[PDB]
Design a protein around this ligand. Structure first.
Ligand SMILES: CCCCCCCCCCCCC/C=C\[C@H](O)[C@H](N)CO
Ligand SMILES: CCCCCCCCCCCCC/C=C\[C@H](O)[C@H](N)CO
Lengths: 48, 97, 297, 245, 245, 297, 49
């Protein structure tokens, strides 16, 4: 979760709304195991 | 580090670029909620827009730590503070800060 | 980092497993030694106390007058690799032509070896088991007749997309392991590794797998260990049209490199459901056979 | 030099004059997790004397027609003390135990109890009796708390397994003509080095009268059974808000 | 190499880019009690990462006419976390602290705050105004919790003592044109090596605007102040049931 | 007793008090050194940041052009044994003949040195003080006249039975310390030790001394430190009948072997009650004196 | 903005323990990810068509 601790303070003449970009990755201890077929993508038929 | 689509609310094709960045605005200072997202990469959600969440789909069992890396794209004259909490399992959606 | 004495003289952080016992080599049965009469006081080995919970340490060299018997009988057949390395029917899949169970030429079978009583009762002697396996598929017509037909045995791990039909997309087996076989050939046979996220499987899970307010509706989750859901096994008749032979696939699982922990009482009532230690209540069978009286035989 | 025992762990003490001995379960003393078996990187808290101490749950009345009682562990210590608050606030848990069952009676009373520890004691139902209804037990019966739950079919232990083969587990007897206490020490038994306390009950304590209590009229009829248990080498990890279940 | 700070204690972290520095109170770092200063023979529990971490209390709105706020310590952490449960269950307590006050504002905002730590901050009343009624403050005003209480007479700090001489204590400033954070580290200050947490408040945190907040119309009017504090080298002893007060 | 690495490399149990500072001998004021002009960049000692909370380290060798001034001025008069070893009126007891306050020839006085403003304001500069004392009793008639009369000054520690009358039983002073004096003799004078259960007295106790539900009735206990209730001081005219001289006992306390901790802001408003930091609200006096304007003097 | 990824470990963000990880990286190799046969083509030889 992301919570406003104090607030987003802005002076006059600057825009009153901003945007945040999240960037996700992994560490050097990350590992994977037991290869399979990916599930969260499909394919409607009649390819070519 | 690949982009996490936390703001996966917009659905129409004209607003699919609104899906990569979530806003922060001027609030009344009660400790409001900005955004929340599950930390499960192989699950269906924001992590499915990563090269971690597309390669962990080709695998069944994963281990190790993650890291989310937020970046602020507001003005230089703007200041502020945010609390970024990882609530481990069992914890429901927290109602307040 | 340690100054006070109530942290230097602490037994906090002892990670070594203080064991009272030591595994000793026992390749043969224990040899008997010669024993003569004893007519002494204080030495009384026939008197035990089972209230201590330990078993009797009484030998027959202490109770009767015995001879030397060099026993050369082996303990090699009571091992686990000699007791579990014996294939048994863990599953059975049917592929009829006309019917209702599997009428589309494909069949999915959720991997559980708790569906046939004769193999369930052996593994449920222990509560944790870690093993590699060796599956063997024995396909045939209901009449026992062998036919010239090609099949695909796809292993679908959890999360992977389950095939919904005969002409589906998941059968392309780019990452899922698959096996093609003809029914005229010998039975297939593959060796599986230990595939659990944990250190061992467990046939009894005393608890609920999710959090949440446990109510009457979501009660069937009691006892579900998701460390044990190793996936799904799927079969089709490889083709675009319907087949012309009804089939029945039988699966035979042999364990190897077995390890086991925490023995259990073995069951005596008849099983009723899969992954469920339920029983009939009015018909509680005793463990054995009855008698007319205790003084007669 | 063996019938007397003094169990001092923490700020609590038990003194007994009619002990049998102390059973260490499966030849293993409780310990803390090693750097090899552990996977969680978060540092675990080790509250060494505030939770590692004896807790007294309730008292059960042994009668002529008492069939038996079971308690699931550590469901019994989720609303009791600093143990049942570190566990509500943490997600993981790892502790051994030291159970102690008291039943004092005279030298004119007779009876026996089997005090056994059955790991992963899953609970079944009679399935409608006829064996045709696929039923499951409710939540008050699978995790019944400190009050316990009474066995309705003790011969099959409400799981289809026999009471006669239960002596392969940890066990002691309470024979009222020899002893009145049973001390069992249990290590952490699970496939996982750490596990949740609010969802998974690692073992069950079974208290079953094999031999019924008999006495003559005039004596004391009210004969209680009392469970008293101590965590040992406890560890907690993964800190978030408080949840009951 | 000094305006940036990262405070990692436990499982929590604070990152700041407009820091001043870190004040260590009275030249002393928090520590655990020695075998000479201690008198209690009972072993104390030292939960090292479950209570020794940052807690965020509330948020206070700085306005033009804000007079000040005070928080008593450790009244603020008696209903919050594993700290406020070991303390309800134990009779003694001994911890340092690390306070951190946040107030972020722009480069077009101006103001200052004095963030001082006054030990044994006893609270007075106006005594009916005329000074003839022997009155005492209520309980909501002496131990007000995490919400704090608003100073009604900040010039005398509601104790008859001046705000000008408060810089002899621990203190930092929050000057919105230089910094937005104040890190104060406080050891355990008492005549006793251990003391009760539910009756005795060792110190008070004072947040007073000397210079009023001023800005021009169009900017952000809502400027909060946020307190974030960490126990450090905590110890508890003397275990009994749970009491709130 | 330690195996894991997260207890060997722990800073748990560090009992030593890690101090950043070191007390150095400063018998004289600091000598000034010679300083010339500086016309450099980067070196800027006049610029501080009080937001850090620390004070200025700026010397006058850095701000002006100075000379060598071997200062031989001592710091021996700012010590605490030179600042508190000065007797002051902590109490005053009156023994009238006819009246209402003390009409029976005896008087009890609860020991508090927070009853006269001029001695309270000095000790309330610190919040913890540890000292031996030296009391001195100065008895006289209201008119200043000295008379031939014998008195008994009994110290009644807490718990000991307080005397209810002139002819009571507690005045036999078998274990309580007592002092007999004639008014014609010099003033009495006794040295008291540090008598607290704690390590130091404390003139400010932020908290309630008992447990319990704190309500409006039992509110006056706020601020009571029972580590400081050192007892009760009692006086009588030694006799069986009534006296014939009215008396007034004045008590003068001098400290020695003083130690003090945690300085405090010193008070500016007028005290009103004993062991109570209350003040008047409508009449809040400023700390100093006013002006007509800031540019004029 | 540098474009590089974070070098932040969990030894720097939380209080951690020693965890001797013996988990292998041998299944994320390419010979373990591509050495898995898949249907690349399918040819039909009808009689009438
Ligand atoms: C080409 C086809 C290969 C088929 C391989 C199937 C994977 C088998 C994995 C190991 C199975 C072990 C049995 C596991 C436990 C059961 O599910 C029990 N119900 C657990 O309680
Ligand atoms: C023969 C008579 C001897 C009289 C001796 C009286 C004992 C005095 C003990 C030390 C007094 C120190 C002052 C203590 C503190 C005050 O009570 C303050 N109100 C504390 O806040």
């Amino acid at each position: 979760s992301i919570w406003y601790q104090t607030n987003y303070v802005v002076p006059i003449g600057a825009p009153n709304t901003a945007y945040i970009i999240a960037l996700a990755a992994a560490q050097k201890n990350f590992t994977m195991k037991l290869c399979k077929d990916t599930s969260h993508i499909l394919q409607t038929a009649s390819i070519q | 580090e690949t982009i996490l689509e936390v703001n996966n609310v917009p659905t129409n094709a004209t607003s699919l670029m609104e899906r990569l960045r979530f806003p922060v605005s001027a609030q009344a200072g009660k400790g409001e909620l900005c955004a929340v997202f599950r930390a499960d990469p192989g699950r269906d959600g924001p992590w499915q827009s990563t090269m971690l969440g597309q390669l962990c789909g080709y695998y069944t069992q994963w281990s190790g730590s993650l890291e989310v890396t937020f970046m602020f794209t507001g003005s230089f004259m703007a200041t502020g503070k945010m609390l970024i909490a990882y609530t481990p399992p069992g914890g429901p959606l927290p109602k307040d800060r | 980092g340690d100054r006070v004495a109530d942290v230097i003289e602490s037994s906090i952080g002892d990670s070594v497993s203080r064991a009272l016992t030591q595994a000793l080599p026992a390749p043969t049965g224990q040899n008997t030694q010669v024993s003569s009469h004893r007519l002494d006081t204080g030495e009384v080995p026939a008197l035990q106390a089972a209230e201590i919970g330990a078993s009797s340490n009484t030998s027959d060299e202490s109770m009767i007058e015995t001879r030397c018997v060099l026993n050369s009988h082996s303990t090699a057949e009571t091992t686990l690799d000699s007791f579990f390395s014996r294939a048994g029917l863990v599953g059975e899949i049917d592929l009829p032509l006309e019917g209702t169970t599997n009428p589309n030429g494909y069949a999915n079978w959720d991997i559980d070896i708790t569906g046939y009583a004769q193999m369930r009762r052996k593994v449920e002697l222990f509560t944790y088991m870690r093993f590699d396996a060796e599956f063997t598929f024995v396909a045939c017509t209901p009449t026992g007749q062998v036919v010239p037909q090609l099949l695909q045995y796809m292993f679908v791990p959890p999360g992977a997309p389950k095939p919904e039909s005969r002409e589906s997309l998941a059968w392309q087996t780019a990452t899922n392991p698959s096996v093609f076989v003809k029914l005229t050939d010998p039975p297939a046979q593959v060796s599986v590794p230990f595939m659990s996220p944990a250190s061992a499987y467990q046939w009894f899970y005393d608890g609920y797998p999710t959090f949440g307010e446990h109510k009457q509706e979501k009660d069937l989750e009691y006892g579900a260990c998701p460390n044990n859901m190793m996936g799904t096994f799927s079969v089709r008749t490889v083709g675009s049209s319907k087949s012309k032979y009804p089939l029945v696939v039988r699966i035979y699982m042999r364990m190897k490199h077995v390890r086991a922990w925490i023995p259990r009482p073995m069951r005596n009532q008849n099983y009723l459901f899969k992954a469920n230690p339920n029983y009939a209540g009015n018909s509680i069978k005793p463990t054995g056979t009855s008698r007319s009286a205790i003084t007669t035989l | 030099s063996d019938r007397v025992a003094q169990l001092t762990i923490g700020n609590s003490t038990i003194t007994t004059q009619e002990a049998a001995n102390i059973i260490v379960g499966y030849g293993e003393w409780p310990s803390y997790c090693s750097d090899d078996d552990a996977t969680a990187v978060d540092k675990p808290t080790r509250p060494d004397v505030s939770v590692n101490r004896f807790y007294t749950l309730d008292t059960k009345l042994w009668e002529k027609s008492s069939k038996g009682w079971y308690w699931k562990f550590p469901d019994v210590l989720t609303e009791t003390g600093v143990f049942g608050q570190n566990a509500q606030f943490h997600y993981l848990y790892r502790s051994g135990f030291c159970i102690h069952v008291q039943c004092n009676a005279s030298k004119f009373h007779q009876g026996a109890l089997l005090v056994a520890i059955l790991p992963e004691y899953v609970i079944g139902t009679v399935a409608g009796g006829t064996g045709t209804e696929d039923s499951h037990p409710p939540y008050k019966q699978t995790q019944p708390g400190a009050d316990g739950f009474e066995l309705q079919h003790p011969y099959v232990l409400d799981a289809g397994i026999p009471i006669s083969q239960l002596t392969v587990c940890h066990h002691q007897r309470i024979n009222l003509r020899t002893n009145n206490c049973a001390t069992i020490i249990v290590p952490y038994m699970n496939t996982l080095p750490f596990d949740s306390a609010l969802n998974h009950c690692n073992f069950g304590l079974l208290v079953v009268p094999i031999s019924p209590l008999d006495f003559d009229q005039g004596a004391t009829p009210v004969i209680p059974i009392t469970i008293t248990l101590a965590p040992m080498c406890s560890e907690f990890a993964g800190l978030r808000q408080a949840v009951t279940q």
